[PDB]
């Protein structure tokens, strides 16, 4: 005999539901899995990042991807916040720009 | 530079411009294709016989 389970990406997690009455191609749990089109695969992982080594001592509470500023050129930067200061960083250096 | 199949007719000078740093791996793979294509028969090249 056989029981074909095709289009494995068709629908992902179906919890809250009778695990014995799901469609063939549906999962009762999934973690770090990505579903697309017709297919299933491992999601992209987490991995670190740094502009400038001064940043890795930093717990940024929120931020912005601003592209332009009058003093900058046509080059993008970041506006990044903390518990105590607002910073800017641009792949070259760091700036406290808080309202003095 | 994908196109070179006659081999030895590559363009080493310029079209690199010290730019991209993503194409070095591709160039190495391309060089491997050129080397393999020229001599796809190697078992024991002990016939050096330089003279």
């Amino acid at each position: 005999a056989l029981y074909p389970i095709k289009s494995l990406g068709a629908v992902g997690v179906i919890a809250d539901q009778a695990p014995t009455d799901l469609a063939p191609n549906a999962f009762t749990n999934a973690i770090n899995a990505r579903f697309v089109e017709q297919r299933v695969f491992k999601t992209g992982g987490n991995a670190p990042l740094s502009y400038v080594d001064e940043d890795k001592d930093l717990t940024p509470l929120s931020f912005v991807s601003m592209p332009f500023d009058y003093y900058s050129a046509g080059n993008s930067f970041l506006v990044v916040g903390t518990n105590k200061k607002l910073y800017k960083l641009t792949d070259e250096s760091l700036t406290d720009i808080s309202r003095k | 530079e994908t196109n070179a199949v006659v081999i030895t007719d590559l363009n080493p000078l310029y079209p690199r411009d010290r730019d991209y740093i993503y194409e070095g791996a591709a160039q190495i793979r391309l060089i491997k294709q050129t080397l393999q294509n020229t001599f796809p028969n190697v078992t024991e090249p002990v016939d050096i016989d330089s003279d």
Binding site: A1, L2, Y3, P4, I5, K6, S7, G9, A10, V11, G12, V13, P19, T20, P24, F27, T28, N29, A30, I31, N32, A33, R34, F35, V36, Q38, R39, V40, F41, K42, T43, G44, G45, N46, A47, P48, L49, S50, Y51, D55, K56, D57, L58, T59, P60, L61, S62, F63, V64, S65, S76, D91 | R18, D19, Y20, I21, Y22, G24, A25, A26
Partner: protein
Amino acid sequence: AVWNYEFDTWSFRTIPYAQCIGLVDPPVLERGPIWSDFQEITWDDPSIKELVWRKDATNFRQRVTIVGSFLKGFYQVDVGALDYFYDRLNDVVIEKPLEMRLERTGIDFDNVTNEWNQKHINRFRPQTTGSGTYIFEAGGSQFSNEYGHPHTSKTYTIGVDRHVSVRLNHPYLFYNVIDNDVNSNAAINGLTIEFAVGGRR
């Protein structure tokens, strides 16, 4: 918890202790650079190692989703497979291979056989893609309500293996697929489970 709005399908994932998240431009060393920039760098990895000649792209402007993290720093949140766990017992960060799990409890085969019928399993004949190394598990229960107990587990290593031999007979199968491995980009289009029928008491 992640919803793919192109197909209306849900999954879940780990993220690296995010305070905040956003799209952004990346650093230069990643921003499609130039052999003519490393004039101060050495092949000998000044603690910088994580540079693949060409990193797959999500965007034509080659942009990046970044997480502002509790772990004193920043992280990219969709990139080549690792995970950054934390340890309060030691107050240290840990890096480990990213683990996918897929799980379906209670495959009853009710579209070919009755529920109650015991079902000899032999094989999973998948139709995979890419490169990788999966771990399949299988087990079952005699009863409809349990998440069954494991009978077996095996590696599936692509290009080498075409199937997985699992011996069971319980009327309600389950399987897990796990992918723990670092150098994998494999995928599954589908399965094909080989089976027979016993009986019932």
